[PDB]
Amino acid sequence: YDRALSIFSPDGHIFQVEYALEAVKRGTCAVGVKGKNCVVLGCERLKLQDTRITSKVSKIDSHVVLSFSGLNADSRILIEKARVEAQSHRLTLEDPVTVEYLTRYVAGVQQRYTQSGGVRPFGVSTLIAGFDPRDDEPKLYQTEPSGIYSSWSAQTIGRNSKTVREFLEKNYDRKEPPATVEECVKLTVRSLLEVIEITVVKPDSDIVALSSEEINQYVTQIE
Amino acid sequence: GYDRHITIFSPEGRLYQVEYAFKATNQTNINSLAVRGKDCTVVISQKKVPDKLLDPTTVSYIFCISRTIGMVVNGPIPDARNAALRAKAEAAEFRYKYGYDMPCDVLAKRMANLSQIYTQRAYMRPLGVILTFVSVDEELGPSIYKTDPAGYYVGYKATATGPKQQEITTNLENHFESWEKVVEFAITHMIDALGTEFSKNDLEVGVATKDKFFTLSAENIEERLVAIAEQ
Amino acid sequence: YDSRTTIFSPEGRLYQVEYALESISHAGTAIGIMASDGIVLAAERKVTSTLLEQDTSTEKLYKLNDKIAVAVAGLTADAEILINTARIHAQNYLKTYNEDIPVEILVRRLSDIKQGYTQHGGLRPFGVSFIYAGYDDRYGYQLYTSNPSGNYTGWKAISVGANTSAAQTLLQMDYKDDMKVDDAIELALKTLSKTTDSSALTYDRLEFATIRKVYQKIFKPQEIKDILVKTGI
Amino acid sequence: DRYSFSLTTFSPSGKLGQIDYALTAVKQGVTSLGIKATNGVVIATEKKSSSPLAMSETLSKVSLLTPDIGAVYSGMGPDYRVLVDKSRKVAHTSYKRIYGEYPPTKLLVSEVAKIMQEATQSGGVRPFGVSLLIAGHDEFNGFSLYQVDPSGSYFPWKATAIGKGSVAAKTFLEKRWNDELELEDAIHIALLTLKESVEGEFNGDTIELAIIGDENPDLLGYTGIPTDKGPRFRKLTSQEINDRLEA
Amino acid sequence: VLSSAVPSLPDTLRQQEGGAVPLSTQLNDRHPLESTLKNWETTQRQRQMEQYRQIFGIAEPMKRTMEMEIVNRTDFNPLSTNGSIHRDILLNKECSIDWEDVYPGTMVGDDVHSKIEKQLGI
Amino acid sequence: MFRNNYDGDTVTFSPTGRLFQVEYALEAIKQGSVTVGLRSNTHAVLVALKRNADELSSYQKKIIKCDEHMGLSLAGLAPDARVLSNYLRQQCNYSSLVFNRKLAVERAGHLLCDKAQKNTQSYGGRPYGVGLLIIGYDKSGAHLLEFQPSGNVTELYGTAIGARSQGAKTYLERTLDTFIKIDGNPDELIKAGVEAISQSLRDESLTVDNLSIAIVGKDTPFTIYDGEAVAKYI
Amino acid sequence: HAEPSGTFYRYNAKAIGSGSEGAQAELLNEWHSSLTLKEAELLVLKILKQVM
Amino acid sequence: SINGGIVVAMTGKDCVAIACDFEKIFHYGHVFLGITGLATDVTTLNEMFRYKTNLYKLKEERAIEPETFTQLVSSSLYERRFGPYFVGPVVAGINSKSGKPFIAGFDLIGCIDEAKDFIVSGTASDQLFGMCESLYEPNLEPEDLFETISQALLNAAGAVVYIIKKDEVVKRYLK
Amino acid sequence: EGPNGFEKLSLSDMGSLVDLCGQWLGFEPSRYSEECYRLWRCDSAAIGAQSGLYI
Amino acid sequence: AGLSFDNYQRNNFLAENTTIVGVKFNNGVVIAADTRSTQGPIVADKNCAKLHRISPKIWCAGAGTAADTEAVTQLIGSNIELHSLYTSREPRVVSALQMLKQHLFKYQGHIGAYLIVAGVDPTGSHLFSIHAHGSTDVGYYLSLGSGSLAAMAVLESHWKQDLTKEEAIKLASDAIQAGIWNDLGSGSNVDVCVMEIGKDAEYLRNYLTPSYKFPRGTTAVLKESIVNI
Amino acid sequence: TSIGTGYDLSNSVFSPDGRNFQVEYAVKAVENGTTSIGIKCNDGVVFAVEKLITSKLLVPQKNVKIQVVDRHIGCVYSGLIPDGRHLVNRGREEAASFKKLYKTPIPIPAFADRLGQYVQAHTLYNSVRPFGVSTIFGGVDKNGAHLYMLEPSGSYWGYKGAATGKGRQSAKAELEKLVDHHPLSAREAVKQAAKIIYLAHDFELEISWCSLSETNGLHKFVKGDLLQEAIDFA
C-alpha cells in the first residue's frame, strides 16, 4: 500500500501522499502571522555562499506572496506556474488574482500531480499570504502536497513545526490578534527563537523585507 | 531477475530472453538445408507430420515471399507465418518505393532490423524463428541469407538449420546445369547426414530460379527420389 | 522504495535522487573560484591514459555562451544533452531580447529540466552536477552549482565531485574575498593538489579555464604546464 | 499506460545497472582496435563466424558513415547496424542538407553518442550493447579517432582497443605508438596487435581493415570538377591484407 | 490550453502565439497545400493499413499499430523532438530523407513539465 | 494457496487452465439481490427483490426499460450495471435515428456480449460483475436473455440470478411445463413469477416497497409495476 | 447520499463520516414523518453532540 | 522607408569589397552578409543567422567559413519556401585556410549565384548590373577595388563600404 | 475476506449468523434479529460498501 | 516540420499593396546543358553549372524554379546515397525516378522542378524526364528548357540508333548550340556529361566555349574605421 | 516439467527451454471443454458435439453450439466460452469482408490464416492473454472440402479428422481407425461422427455437415429422420 498513489491503505488513507508530508517536515522552517491589517512571514536560513544572489519568500504578484517548505527544487517550479496564472488571470480577466484563487490554483497543481502513478507529487507545502485587490483584510493560506488548502490565522511548516505551532497556539489569540506591525513581527520573531529573515506584506501591494531585525531580537531576548 | 523475463542485460552482459528464443526454433524438431547451384538455389526441409490424421499437404514451412524470393522458417509456424506476412509486405513496399524487385539480402536486413527492435524493446518479445531467405538476385546471382532472433543476418554459400545442423554442415564442408540436379544433391546429403530415408510425404523442397521461386509438389519430389534410387 | 524515482520513502526522501548525488562523488573533482576581477574554473581529468588525446579533448569544461562556462562533474554523457540545451536556450534569449542571457536565468532553466527528470517515472535523474561561471551586468561575476535534484546555490568558491569535503575545507580557510584572478589560480591549483588521489598533479590530468576582464580562456595543455610549474606544483 | 518506468536506474553505490552490464557485453565481444597515424587512421577487427560456410564479405563490421569517416564496433552487431543506419541518416539531415558538406568527426560522434545516451534514460529500450571506434578526417581538425561507449561517453584516442583483448592489445599499442607513425607503419602495428588477440586462424579473410588516409579519386566514380575530390575511407580487400601479412 | 480562470477562452499568455491576436476564427484562410501536406504521411499510412486489412485481415493492422503505440508511448524524451530510432524501422524510413527531417521546426510554456503533463494528460 | 499466484489479473492462466479473475466476477452476482425472469409464448415477465441500504433509505432501482418493447433487470455490481444498462440504451436509440428499426431483442443481448468479453482478455480492465435478465417482445415474439459477465448470452424460458437464485431456478424447472402454457393471461404469469422468486427468500417477506415487477407482450409495452401497484400480486 | 462507488440512495435521514454508525442508530430511534424543520435542526445538533 | 536599400559585393585580389546605401551589412566572424528587402525580414534573418552561427562556433569550436555559411543561408531561406522572406542577401568573405575571396548572391528562396566577379541585390539593381560590368576588372588591388566598387555604387544610386582583408577589415563612408 | 481487523461479511452471512448465535445465547430470535440487522446494515465495518456496491 | 507557410498571408498582403538535352547512345547516355542563368531579362550569373549529381553515375539537369530543382535534387541525392549504403548496391536510375516523382506528386506541383534524369545502372542505361506534377516519360533523346524546341530540332534531324560516344557528344553539344543562338534564355558555354555502362562518368565542364581603373583617391571619404573580428 | 514456475506468470515470455507456458496453460483450458470432432469427407465435412444439457430452462432451438461463420463455413470450438464466441464473430467479420471486396466466398485456407494471425497476435504482448479455445472449422470451396484446427498458440493445420475437449484421446484414437478403415461419403460420415461422440462419452448429440453433392455447397444441420438414423447407428 506504501508504494503507490492509487492504492488506499486498509485503514483508509493513502500512504504515498502522507510520505510527501514528511518531506515537507524535513524542509526549512517557515512561519506566517496574520495581523489586523498586515501579514508577516518568517523563514529559517555556508561560509562561502554568495548571499547576494540568493529570499525564501518569493512574491507571486505585486500584492501576493508565497513562502514554502520542503524540496526547494519543486517549490521553484510550483512558484513559476503560480506566477504565470497570476498574469494570465490579469490578462483574461481585468482584476488581479484573489489570494483564495491563487492558493486554489496552486493546490490544484499539487492535487493534479497526484492523479497518476508516473508522477512524483510536489514535496512542498506553500504558505501563501497577501491581500485581495482593493481590500484591507489580511489573508494567509497553506497548501499541502495532497492538494488540501486551508486558511490560517498563523501557521508554521517544516523543520520544528509542532514545537513552533504550539508556541503560536498559546501566544496567539483569535479574539486578541496583534493589531500592530511590531506586535505581529515580535510574535513571528519570538516564534522563530523557540528553535532571522522577516517579510511584511501590507495592503495595496506594499511588500517590504525587513532589515535590522536585531532590535526585535534584542528586545524579545531581554524579556 | 527482470533480465530473465524481459530483454535487458544480465550481470553477465547477455540477453537471456533472446537466447531462449533460439531454443524455441528447435521445438518443431525440423531441420533444413539450402545450397547454391550455378544458376539456381535449392532449399530442403523435413516434413515430420507425424500424426496420421494431420494432412501433410498443409504442413509446409516454406513460403513464397515474392516472385523471386522464398524463405524457410525453423521454429513454431505461428511465428513463421507472422514473419512471412512481414516479409511478404516489405518486399512489395520496396518495389513500390524504389521501383525494382526486393533483393534477398536487403529483405534479411529489414527483417533482422525488425528483430533488433524486439531484442531492445522491453515490451516486445523476440519472434523466436530462424528465417532462411533463398533467391537468385539479378546482380549477385544465387544467394542464401539466414536471419535469427538475435537480429543477425549472414550470407551463406550453403547452410543447414535445426537440431542436427552441425551434422549436416560438417558434411557440406567436407564436400566443399538444371535445378533438378541440385535437388538430388541436396536430398542425398540430407539422407547421408541424417541417415533417414525419405518419401514424398516426409519431404518438402523449394527451388529459386532466375524467373521465380516455386515449391515442388508431392509428386515432383517423388520423381527426384526415384532418380536418386537409380544411382 | 528506490526501484523508481517517483516514490517517496517513509522518511520522505528520494533514494533514486540520492544515488545520483552519490554517483557524482566518484567523478573527477571540479573546483570553481570567484575572484574580485574574474572567475576561475578547474577540473581533475580522472579518465587518464597516455594514449588519450590530452589536447582537444575538453570533457569537464564547456562553453555555453560568451561570458559563461560550466565545469562538469559526473556522467559526461548526460552533460552534453543539457549543455546543448543551455546553448540553445542562451541564444534564444539573445534572439529574443538582443541581450546576453543572465547567468541566473540559464542556471534556473537547467535546474528545472533536471528537476523534471526526478518527477517522471520513465526518466532517471541526470547523474551530473555543473559549476556555472559567468558575467552579466545585473550581478557581474557570479558562480553557481547545480545538483541532480535540480536545486542550485550561489557560491564564492565551490568544489564538486570526488573529495568535495576535503577541497571545500581548504577553500574556507584560504579564501579571501579580496583576491585577484591570479591568486584564485594558485588557490585552485593548490586545492586540487592536496585533494587528488594521484601521487602528483600533472598537466595531462588537469583542465582549466578562466573568465576575467570579458574574455573566457580555456587553457591549452601547453600553458597549463607553464602555470603548474609557476605555482611550484 | 501513459508511461513506462526507466529500465536504467542508479544503484545504491551510485552506478547505473544496465550501463555496466552493457559494457560487459562489449568486453565479452570480439576485439577491435584503431590507431591514429600522422597521415591517416586505421581501424581493424577480426570476423568470428558461426560456420565456415558463411560468406565473409557479408560480415562487414567496419562500415562507412561518410566518405571521410568510418566506424568499427565490438559487441552486438544488430545494435551497431541500427546505429550506423541512423548515423548515416543523421549526417545528412543535421549537417549536409544544412551546410552542404559532410559533418566533422567530432560532431558526428557527438550525435551518435546522443542517440546512445537517450537509450540510457528510457522505459522501453535497454542501452545499446556496443562501443564504436569512429575514425575520420576533418579539413580543420585533421585525422581523429574516437571511442564511444554504451553510456554515450566518447573520448578521443591516439590508439585504442575494445573487446576481449582490449587490455592486452591496449598495453601492446602503448609500447608501439609514437607521434611519428606513418600510416603504413600503423597498419603493420594494427595487424600485429590483432594477431595476439585473435584466436585460431589469422589471414585476410578472418580480418578486415579500413584506413582513413589520402584521397582515392579512383573510388569517386566520376571525373571532372577537381574541387570535388574522392573519399578517404578505404576498406582493404582480403587480397591486400594477405599481402601485408606476409611482409 | 484553455484559461484556468474561465474554461471557455484560450489562455493568451500560456499559449505563446503573439497575443490573442491570432484568434481562432481567423485561422481559416490557409495555403491550399497546407492541409494536404500537413497530414500527407498520415493518409498514406492509413491507406496502407486499409490494404493490409483487406488482404491480410484485421490482425496485421492491429499488430502494426500496437507495435507503434508500444514504441511511441514508451519513448519520452522531453529534450528531443527527433523521432525514435525504432520508429523509423517500423515506418520503413530508416534510409529516407524528407523536408520534415531536414527542417524539424520561450520563457513561459516550453518547459519539460509542460510535456510531462501532456504526455500523461495529468 | 496456489490460486493466489495466478489470480492477480484477467490475463494469467493458471497451470490447470483456469482463469480465476473472471470466475470471481461471475461470483460477484451472488452478492446481488435475487431477480427472476420467465416468459410464455406471448408474454415475458421480470420479478426482482430490491434491497435498501438502511431502513431510512429508498429501495434501489433494479429494473430498467430500454424502450417500450423490451427491458432488463440487474444483479451484481451497481457501477457495472450503470455502464451496461445505459450503454445498451445508447444502442436502442442509435438504430432508430439512422435506420428507424426496432433493435431486436436477440441483437440487443449479443451487442452487449462483445463488450464483456473484451475486458476478460486485456490487462488493466476487469470483467463486469453484473448479470442481466433482458425480456422483450418483437415480431418473432417473447424473448428472455440471461447475460453473464463472461460474455455468455443464453435464450431461456425462465431463470433466476443473484443471491440464493438456485431455489427460484429449481421451482421454474419444476414448473416449466406450466407457465409456458400461460398464454394470453399476463396476470397469471406474473403470479407464477412472484411465486418463483418467493422460494429464494430467507427472512424478508414480499412488500409493495421492495418488490418490483415488469411485463411486456403483444398488448403490453414494457410496464414496471412497483409500489402500491404490486400489492395485488403479493 | 452519493457513495464513491457510484451508487446514490434517497435517504430520509443520513449521517456520514466519523461516528456515522452511532448517528445512524439514533436517527433510526428519533426520525419520524411529522418531524418539523425546527426540531430537525435541534435533532441534527443533538446528533452532533454525541458523535462529536 | 528604410526598405529596398541596395547592396553590392565585388571580388578583388586577395580581398573583397561589399557596400550598401540601421545597418544592412552584418558580419558573423570573418564572413559578411548584406541583406536587401523588407526591414523586418532583414532584422529577423540577422537574429536567425546570429543564432545559427553562434551555435556553429560553440559546437565546432571554429568560425563558420563563407563557403559553409553560403549553404546555411540557402537552406534557411528555402525553409518558408511558401511565404519566403522578401529579401535578397549577399555574402562576402575570405576562407581562412585557402584565402580565396568568396562572394555569392541569393533569390527569395536560396538560389546560389556564386559569381566570381560581382554581386548586387535590391532595388535599382538593373542599373547596377551594367555599371559593375563596364567598370569591373579582374584582380584589383584593395585600394583600386575601393574606387571601382564605390564609383559603381554612388553613380548608380549615404553609403558605406567594407574592404575585407585576411586579418584586417576597413569600414569607410562615402559622400 | 480482507486483512485482520477489516474483514467483510456478506448480507447472507449476517442473516445466517444472528439467527444461529441466538440459538445458543437464547434471545428472542425475531426481536434479536430485528435489533441486529439495524446495527449490521445501517453502518458497520462488516457491511462496508456491500449495501450500495451491489444491486 | 518541413516547409512552414509561416508568412504566406503576410506576403499576400504585401503583394496586394535555359536549354538541357539528354541523348542515349549505344553504350551509355549523354546529358548536356548551357551555363546562362537569368534573373528576369537580366543575366544574373553566366558560367553557371546546371548539371547536378544525384549519384556518381546518375546526373540531373532541370529548369523552372531553380531553387526547387536544386532542393529536391539534393534531397533525392541523399536518399540515393543512404539507400545505396543501406543496400550496399549501386543505385538504380528507376529508384531515383520513383522517389523523385513520388516526392513531387506529394506537393501537387507547387515545387516547380522540371528535370531530366540520366544515368547508368547495373541493368543498363536510362534517360527520364520529370515534371513538377510528377508525370514522367522515357525516351532515347530529350530536351528541356526555353530552348528545348530549338534543341529538339537538331536532335530529331540528326539522331539515329546506336550512336557512338563521339557522335552523341557532338549531337548533344550541337543541339545546345542551337538553343544558345536562337533562345535568349540560353547562352554562354556548354556543360556536357557522359555516363557509360562500364566506365566512370566524365563531367566535361566548359566542353565548348563559344581600362577603367580609376586613380586612387577619386572617391571622397567622410570617415574611415577599422573593424575587429 | 509442466508448470514452469517463474516464467509462467506473464505472457510473451520464453522459458529456458523455449516454451511459452501461458500458451500451454491455455491448451489445458481447451482440454476441459466438451469434446468436439470434425471429419473430412470426399465431398464435404462433418461436425459433431456432445452438448451437455444443463437444464430444461434453455430454449432447445436457440441453444446451438455448432456456429456457422459463413454460409459455406462451419465452426465448432472447445474451451473458454468468451474466447470461442469472440473468435467466431471476428472470423465472421473476416468472411463478410472478403466477400464484400472480392465478391466471392472466402477460401477456407485463407480464412484460417486470418484467424491464425489474430490468435497468434495475442501471444506477442503481456497486456493480453492467449485465446483459450481450440477451434475446429471447415467447409467447401473451389478446391473442395477443408478441415482446419487452430490451437491457442495460433498454429493451425489441415486435417482429415480432428478432435478436441476432454473426450479427445478416445475420439482421436477411434477417428484414426475410421480414416484407416475408409481412406467417406457425406452420408456415411454423419453416422460415424455420431458413433464417435457416443463412444467418447447427460449429453445431447448435435451434428452438422456441409457437402458439395447433398447440400450444393451449403452448411446445414442434421435433423429429423437423419438425426435419429445416426443415433440408431451409434
Query: Span between N and C termini of chain F?
Result: 47 Å
Looking at the structure, what is the overall shape of chain F?
globular
Strand order of the largest sheet of chain F: 8-1-2-9-10
Q: Round the Cα radius of gyration of chain F to an integer and report it.
A: 18 Å
Distance N to C terminus of chain E: 13 Å
- The helix tally of chain E amounts to 6
Proportion of residues in helical segments of chain E:
40-55%
Main sheet summary of chain E: none
Mind telling me the C-alpha Rg of chain E?
A: 18 Å
Family (chain D): Belongs to the peptidase T1A family.
Protein name (chain D): Proteasome subunit alpha type-2
Subcellular location (chain D): Cytoplasm; Nucleus
Cross-link (Glycyl lysine isopeptide (Lys-Gly) (interchain with G-Cter in ubiquitin)) (chain D): 106
Show the helix and strand layout.
This is part of a larger assembly, with eleven protein chains of eleven kinds.
Chain C: H1 15-24, E1 30-35, E2 38-44, E3 61-65, E4 68-74, H2 76-97, H3 103-117, E5 128-134, E6 142-146, E7 152-155, E8 157-160, H4 164-174, H5 181-195, E9 206-212, E10 215-218, H6 221-231
Antiparallel strand pairs in C: 1-2, 1-8, 2-9, 3-4, 4-5, 5-6, 6-7, 9-10
Helix pairs in contact in C: 2-3, 4-5
Chain F: H1 3-6, H2 20-28, E1 35-39, E2 43-49, E3 63-65, E4 70-76, H3 78-99, H4 105-119, E5 130-137, E6 142-148, E7 152-155, E8 158-161, H5 165-174, H6 176-179, H7 186-198, E9 211-217, E10 223-226
Chain G: H1 20-30, H2 37-51
Provide a descriptive summary of the structure in words.
This is part of a larger assembly, with 11 protein chains of 11 kinds. Chain A has 6 helices and 9 strands; from the N terminus they run αβββααββββααββα. Chain A has about 220 residues and is α+β, with helices and mostly antiparallel strands. In chain A, a hairpin with a 3-residue loop joins β8 and β9. The radius of gyration of chain A is 18 Å and the shape is globular. Chain C is an alpha+beta fold. Chain C contains 6 helices and 10 strands; from the N terminus they run αββββααββββααββα. Chain C has a 5-stranded antiparallel sheet. With about 55 residues, chain I is mostly helical. In chain I, α1 packs antiparallel against α2 (about 30-40). Chain I starts with 10 loop residues before the first helix and ends in a 14-residue tail after the last helix. Classes of the chains: A alpha+beta (about 220), B alpha+beta (about 230), C alpha+beta (about 230), D alpha+beta (about 250), E mainly alpha (about 120), F alpha+beta (about 230), G mainly alpha (about 50), H alpha+beta (about 180), I mainly alpha (about 55), J alpha+beta (about 230), K alpha+beta (about 230). β9 of chain H pairs antiparallel with β13 of chain J. Chain G: This is Proteasome subunit alpha type-5. Chain G: It is found in: Cytoplasm; Nucleus. Chain G: It comes from Saccharomyces cerevisiae (strain ATCC 204508 / S288c) (Baker's yeast). Chain G: Belongs to the peptidase T1A family.
